[PDB]
Amino acid sequence: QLLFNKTKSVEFTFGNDTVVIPCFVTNMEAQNTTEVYVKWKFKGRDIYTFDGALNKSTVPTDFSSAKIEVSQLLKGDASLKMDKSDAVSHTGNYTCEVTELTREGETIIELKYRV
């Protein structure tokens, strides 16, 4: 099972440069992104996927700014980055699902708006 440096919640203000939801796998064993699939979920909906085999990201229209930094994925960094305007209406539990060839894991982070 993939294990994570878990975080219960992160907060942001409109003074934040950008919204970053952390997801860090500590025992990642993939050696090329073709072996990797990343799914981000919110309120039961898939709001970001990265298909490493096809080098293809998919987002719904209400998360059009969401992205991950693919150069960091094999270090275990699947953190989701999005604009504040996409985040402010979607506070709550986010789920990060990371899948390799034979192993996978998921972790939950609550995004909060604070001031």
Partner: antibody, heavy 118, light 108 residues
């Protein structure tokens, strides 16, 4: 075109050893995980081994763990499966497959036949 | 020890039918489920990955759906050349396991 060609299948006696080979072409071999799947005479499929694209990590089901070894030579674009302490249940057609996340196997070879029998 | 169930084992259908094939997982695997077809005297080929993503070069009449524990491969307007065995495979859960296969037969 992606092409995978297995070889090395043969009739072998129980307790013997066998090394299967798979030559790969048509893609960047070193950029993909690889797997072996076998199909028994009842036509059921069983995954038996997977290796990451750099060769470092190997994965096996419990049925074969400890006596199958998967390996690869990325300079030679070749995949290997070494089978030790063979049992009659290892009689099957053995396929090499290119693998993706979740072990989705988007290209397969034609297979090589192994029969374990005295 | 995840178990993948395909029922029925054999399915006879009519050309032009919209056919649905079933796969059931002994545990939740979300949408991490793949579909293969193996025609007679061929090796399997990937039809659908992750429950519903089509594969390049596969005929457009194949599609997949479902999440969690129950999955469906659809063939809209099945053809005689579609005869063969269809296998599901979990993308989550260990080990990576194949269902027993559903053999598709064409009625004539």
């Amino acid at each position: 075109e992606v092409k995978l060609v297995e070889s090395g299948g043969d009739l072998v006696k129980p307790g013997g050893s066998l090394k299967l080979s798979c030559a790969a072409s048509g893609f960047t071999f070193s950029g993909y995980g690889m797997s072996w799947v076998r199909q028994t005479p009842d036509k059921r499929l069983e995954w038996v081994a997977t290796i990451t694209s750099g060769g470092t990590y190997t994965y096996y089901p419990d049925s074969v763990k400890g006596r199958f070894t998967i390996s690869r030579d990325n300079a030679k674009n070749t995949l290997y499966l070494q089978i030790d302490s063979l049992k009659s249940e290892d009689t099957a057609i053995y396929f090499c497959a290119r693998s993706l996340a979740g072990n989705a196997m988007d290209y397969w070879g034609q297979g090589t036949s192994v029969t374990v029998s005295s | 020890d995840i178990v993948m169930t395909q029922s029925p084992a054999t399915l006879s259908v009519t050309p032009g039918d919209r056919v649905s094939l079933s796969c059931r997982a002994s545990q939740t695997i979300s949408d991490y489920l793949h579909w293969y077809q193996q025609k007679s005297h061929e090796s399997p080929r990937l039809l659908i990955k992750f429950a519903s993503q089509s594969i390049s070069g596969i005929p457009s009449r194949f599609s997949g759906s479902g999440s969690g524990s129950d999955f469906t491969l659809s063939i809209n307007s099945v053809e005689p050349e579609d005869v063969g065995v269809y296998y599901c495979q979990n993308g989550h859960g260990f080990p990576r396991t194949f269902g027993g296969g559903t053999k598709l037969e064409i009625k004539r």
